[PDB]
Amino acid sequence: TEFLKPRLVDIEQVSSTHAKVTLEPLERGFGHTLGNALRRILLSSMPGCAVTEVEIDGVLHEYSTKEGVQEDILEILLNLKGLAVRVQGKDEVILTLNKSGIGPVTAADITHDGDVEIVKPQHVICHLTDENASISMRIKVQRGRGYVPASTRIHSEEDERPIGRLLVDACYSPVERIAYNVEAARVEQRTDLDKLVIEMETNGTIDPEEAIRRAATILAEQLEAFVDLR
Amino acid sequence: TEFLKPRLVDIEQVSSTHAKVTLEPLERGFGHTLGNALRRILLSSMPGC
Amino acid sequence: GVLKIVKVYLAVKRRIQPGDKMAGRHGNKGVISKINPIEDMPYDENGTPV
């Protein structure tokens, strides 16, 4: 046993969305061992927030069209899937949005709750054409992980909701893309060591470093079973 | 996070040399995540003489 | 004989699944066999999965 642990070195957050993370020194072969295993976890397991339900007044169903609004209701819902939200405290929040007039409605127009940060305020939601048009909605954002579509929910959800309330496919997972490169790290004696460079592209918020911590934690939890139970 | 851990189920030690080990339940994708990572370590990293 | 008739229109959202039929414009057919998790998909050096 010549145990050798890596240490988190550089976190070059090129953008809030895109971040490079170098990591060294790793003993030979562990670059790819750890690189791939983490990548798998990062893509799926990663928990996040997403719009689960929607309620717009004067809207019975998603296939209808609202007057004074360019986008049909489905188009609006698509944009809401894309809406990047960080909820700090609670796991479930219901944000309100009442906007009027001749305006491309953006995320900023949503009334932000004390502990709810809208990561991309400029994110388009709806386009109000008629000035006398006023849109008013309530968007439920929950915390989950992976991808839970509305079709999954309706199947298990024998719990009836009121008509009016529109369920949305929840894309909880924040990690948009991930890749890891392995270069050689050079020590005085050991030139066979390697550095791992993880390039992550995530939606809003979920902090590169924090996501790394969590992903490693999930993997270690699994390893408990193979160590502790035999 | 609703962390789903696997539990070591069966250890069919067909021989002292050869052993099968089933393991369940693993959440989706972790079969290969863990499977391969361990295999790498087991082969190239296990110290010996 | 018919006194009154009621027509209902349902709208259904169908997502693709195994068994559905897909093709290009070159006469290349196929049926979906399996929906693979993104983690398992072949991916290029850059990280972008197929």
Swiss-Prot record, chain B:
**Protein modification:** (Microbial infection) ADP-ribosylated on both alpha subunits by the phage T4 protein ModA. ADP-ribosylated on only one of the alpha subunits by the phage T4 protein Alt.
This protein's assembly is summarised as: Homodimer. The RNAP catalytic core consists of 2 alpha, 1 beta, 1 beta' and 1 omega subunit. When a sigma factor is associated with the core the holoenzyme is formed, which can initiate transcription. Both the N- and C-terminus interact with different regions of transcriptional regulator CRP. The rRNA transcription and antitermination complex (rrnTAC) consists of RNAP, NusA, NusB, NusE (rpsJ), NusG, SubB, ribosomal protein S4, DNA and precursor rRNA; S4 is more flexible than other subunits.
Q: Its biological function?
A: DNA-dependent RNA polymerase (RNAP) catalyzes the transcription of DNA into RNA using the four ribonucleoside triphosphates as substrates. This subunit plays an important role in subunit assembly since its dimerization is the first step in the sequential assembly of subunits to form the holoenzyme.
Q: What is known of its domains?
A: The N-terminal domain is essential for RNAP assembly and basal transcription, whereas the C-terminal domain is involved in interaction with transcriptional regulators (such as CRP) and with upstream promoter elements.
Family per similarity comment:
Belongs to the RNA polymerase alpha chain family.
The name of this protein is DNA-directed RNA polymerase subunit alpha
Originating species? Escherichia coli (strain K12)
Lineage at the top is:
Bacteria, Pseudomonadati, Pseudomonadota, Gammaproteobacteria, Enterobacterales
Curated annotation (Swiss-Prot), chain C:
Parent sequence residues shown: 1045 to 1094 of 1342
Give the source species: Escherichia coli (strain K12)
Q: What intrachain disulfides are recorded? A: none
Task of the protein: DNA-dependent RNA polymerase (RNAP) catalyzes the transcription of DNA into RNA using the four ribonucleoside triphosphates as substrates. Resistance to the antibiotics salinamide A, salinamide B, rifampicin, streptolydigin, CBR703, myxopyronin, and lipiarmycin can result from mutations in this protein.
Tell me what PTMs the record reports for this protein.
Acetylated on several lysine residues in the presence of glucose.
| Protein name per UniProt | DNA-directed RNA polymerase subunit beta
Q: What's the family?
A: Belongs to the RNA polymerase beta chain family.
Q: How does it assemble?
A: The RNAP catalytic core consists of 2 alpha, 1 beta, 1 beta' and 1 omega subunit. When a sigma factor is associated with the core the holoenzyme is formed, which can initiate transcription. The rRNA transcription and antitermination complex (rrnTAC) consists of RNAP, NusA, NusB, NusE (rpsJ), NusG, SubB, ribosomal protein S4, DNA and precursor rRNA; S4 is more flexible than other subunits. In pull-down experiments interacts with CedA.
Q: What is this protein's gene name?
A: rpoB
Biotech and industrial use:
Co-administration of salinamide and rifampicin or salinamide and myxopyronin suppresses the emergence of resistance to both antibiotics.
